[PDB]
Paper text:
In [name], an important opportunistic pathogen that causes numerous acute and chronic infections, the hybrid two-component system (TCS) regulates the swarming ability and biofilm formation with a multistep phospho­relay, and consists of hybrid-sensor [name] (HK), histidine-containing phospho­transfer protein (Hpt) and response regulator (RR). HptB, the target protein in this work, is closely related to biofilm formation, which could increase drug resistance and protect the cell from pinocytosis by the host. According to previous studies, after the sensor proteins [name], PA1976 and PA2824 are auto­phospho­rylated, the phospho­ryl group is transferred to HptB and subsequently to the downstream RR protein PA3346 as illustrated in Fig. 1. In this work, two crystal structures of HptB and the receiver domain of HK [name] ([name]) of [name] have been determined in order to elucidate their interactions for the transfer of the phospho­ryl group. The HptB–[name] complex is further modeled to analyze the binding surface and interactions between the two proteins.
The recombinant [name] protein comprises amino acids 507–651 of hybrid sensor [name] [name] and contains the C-terminal receiver domain. The crystals of [name] with Mg2+ belong to trigonal space group P3121 with one protein molecule in the asymmetric unit. In this (β/α)5 motif, the five-stranded parallel β-sheets, which are β1 (Glu516–Val520), β2 (Arg540–Val544), β3 (Ala561–Asp565), β4 (Ile591–Thr595) and β5 (Asp613–Ala616), are folded in the central core. The surrounding five α-helices are α1 (Pro524–Ser536), α2 (Gly547–Arg556), α3 (Gly573–Arg581), α4 (Gly601–Gln608) and α5 (Arg621–Trp631), among which two (helices α1 and α5) are located on one side, whereas the others (helices α2, α3 and α4) are on the opposite side. Previous studies have shown that the binding of divalent metal ions in the active-site cleft is essential to activate the receiver domain. The surface electrostatic potential around the active-site cleft of [name] is highly negatively charged and suitable to accommodate metal ions [Fig. 7(a)]. The divalent magnesium ion (Mg2+) from the crystallization solution was found to be coordinated in the active-site cleft. The divalent magnesium ion (Mg2+) is hexa-coordinated, of which three positions coordinate with three water molecules, and three with the main-chain oxygen atom of Arg567 and the side-chain oxygen atoms of Asp522 and Asp565. The results suggest that our [name] is in an inactivated form; there might be conformational changes that occur in the side chain of Thr595 and Tyr614 after phospho­rylation, similar to the residue substitutions in E. coli CheY and TMY.
Residue numbers in the entry: 513 to 634
The structure:
Amino acid sequence: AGQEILLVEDNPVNQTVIEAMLRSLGYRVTLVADGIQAVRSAERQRYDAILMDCRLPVLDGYSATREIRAQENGRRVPIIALTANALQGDRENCLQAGMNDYLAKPFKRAELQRILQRWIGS
Ligand SMILES: [Mg+2]
């Protein structure tokens, strides 16, 4: 039916907007809203890619990404950070966690399309 994307996003409107962009591109989307849920979803299913928002409740993007990279198949899954502060706080935290790439919010549907193809076809 389509490639499987884990979208890790805590903000309700970004959840709506980014899930809609992904479903418009033909992806199957699993949405989770915090780092704890990201680590469990990744432990239990192979995803084609994970979109990891940097700032999350419970467990942040840095910690979730570290924990996924320590799992047997999270070791290799493409993880693309979503950053709204690619300019300071996130460069000095989330973006050092083991990301393949990052999107800067606010981003375009075409940018999302471009970055997923880059990694799912890498
Ligand atoms: Mg956030």
